[PDB]
């Protein structure tokens, strides 16, 4: 897929899921692979353990974009506050669940529009438990996002036919990232453990990129 | 929209954004779609890589109009020199930023008037970062252009309501081009990747035109 001008440009189409919970380790390993990526996804284990100031620290030390994987899933008023605090801390984007409904998603979109940031809608998950309720709601959640003008989506990380289906629903221009061919549908892939748990993180990242 | 006599006539209302950086590839692909367009937009990657002589080469080999997308954004005296060098190299028009203010725009208008060429004012951009400062200044930049007699404008490439708003500010006769319905407000559309990265550039261009 060619890059679209109106959505984020992710270097090498590779997003590092920096899931380590210790600040020293997270910054050290990210430093080891800084030449391979310019976009890093950070979640709650690291931020709750080390403080939200870690977001700005990554942006300054590496010049990277930060996507806050906070899977926002509260009522509208609370979602608004979570997004505002996250963007105030410097996050370029935030990942939000769609199962709590349209008004909960809209609350996040309102803050992102006000602050000049982005919202990613999580349309589906791939852990086994996702089959109970998430899988059956995925197409409807993706359509809800499209209907509200969402332009960034996070999709499944195990089944290709699921990607083409999500791509079909969201259209050819919206931005789609997928954890884990894939780049024929998704605009970027997210890789974590395969890189940060590797004996040689740099080698792991370089291997993945050359393959891309 | 009907054509206005006092502004440029773009064949098929389609401008090719020839963004390839290699002279051979740029000339080859443009040759493949020459029957579909008579106006080509060239930017700095190609010109810096191959030399400004490439502008006259396009005009002679294809008989096309060249719009230099140089997003001129310097002080008045320097803008004057950039425009003069660009027009001396044969460009029919040049694209200029409005954020540096009125005197910077006027400097470009003076050289275009002297040399019988045209200035396009870039009123807004559509990449995500444009939300930080460009989006909030767009209406004021467009009004500044109108106030100085600018007759050619480059607008957003993602939101229709933005086009009608720009069209409202600039009036019904000025020339408006838009990257990427749209032709109800803009006089011509600019297409790049969808054509030059296509497996069959000619097919891509013909498809876009028949749709127009």
UniProtKB/Swiss-Prot annotation, chains A, B:
GO terms for biological process: 'de novo' pyrimidine nucleobase biosynthetic process; 'de novo' UMP biosynthetic process. The keyword Lyase applies. The active site is at residue 71. GO terms for molecular function: orotidine-5'-phosphate decarboxylase activity. Keywords: Decarboxylase, Lyase, Pyrimidine biosynthesis. SUPFAM superfamilies: Ribulose-phoshate binding barrel. Pathway: Pyrimidine metabolism; UMP biosynthesis via de novo pathway; UMP from orotate: step 2/2. Substrate binds at residues 19, 41, 69-78, 126, 192-193. Pfam families: OMPdecase. GO terms for cellular component: cytosol. It catalyses: orotidine 5'-phosphate + H(+) = UMP + CO2. CDD domains: OMP_decarboxylase_like. Its EC number is 4.1.1.23. Belongs to the OMP decarboxylase family. Type 1 subfamily. Homodimer. NCBIfam families: PRK13813.1, pyrF. Catalyzes the decarboxylation of orotidine 5'-monophosphate (OMP) to uridine 5'-monophosphate (UMP). This is Orotidine 5'-phosphate decarboxylase. It comes from Methanothermobacter thermautotrophicus (strain ATCC 29096 / DSM 1053 / JCM 10044 / NBRC 100330 / Delta H) (Methanobacterium thermoautotrophicum).
């Amino acid at each position: 897929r060619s890059r679209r001008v109106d959505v984020m440009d992710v270097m090498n189409r590779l997003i590092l899921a920096m899931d380590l919970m210790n600040r020293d380790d997270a910054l050290r390993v990210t430093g080891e692979v800084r030449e391979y990526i310019d976009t890093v996804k950070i979640g709650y284990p690291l931020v709750l353990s080390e403080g939200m100031d870690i977001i700005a620290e990554f942006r300054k030390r590496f010049g990277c974009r930060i996507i806050a994987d906070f899977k926002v899933a509260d009522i509208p008023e609370t979602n608004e506050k979570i997004c505002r605090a996250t963007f105030k801390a410097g996050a370029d984007a935030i990942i939000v669940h769609g199962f709590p409904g349209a008004d909960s998603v809209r609350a996040c979109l309102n803050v992102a529009e006000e602050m000049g940031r982005e919202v990613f809608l999580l349309t589906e998950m791939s852990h086994p438990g996702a089959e109970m309720f998430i899988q059956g709601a995925a197409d409807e959640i993706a359509r809800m996002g499209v209907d509200l003008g969402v332009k960034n989506y996070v999709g499944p990380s195990t089944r290709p036919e699921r990607l083409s289906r999500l791509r079909e629903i969201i259209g050819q221009d919206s931005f789609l990232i997928s954890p884990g061919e894939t780049l024929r549908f998704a605009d970027a892939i997210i890789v974590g453990r395969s890189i940060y748990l590797a004996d040689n993180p740099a080698a792991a990242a370089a291997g993945i990129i050359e393959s891309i």
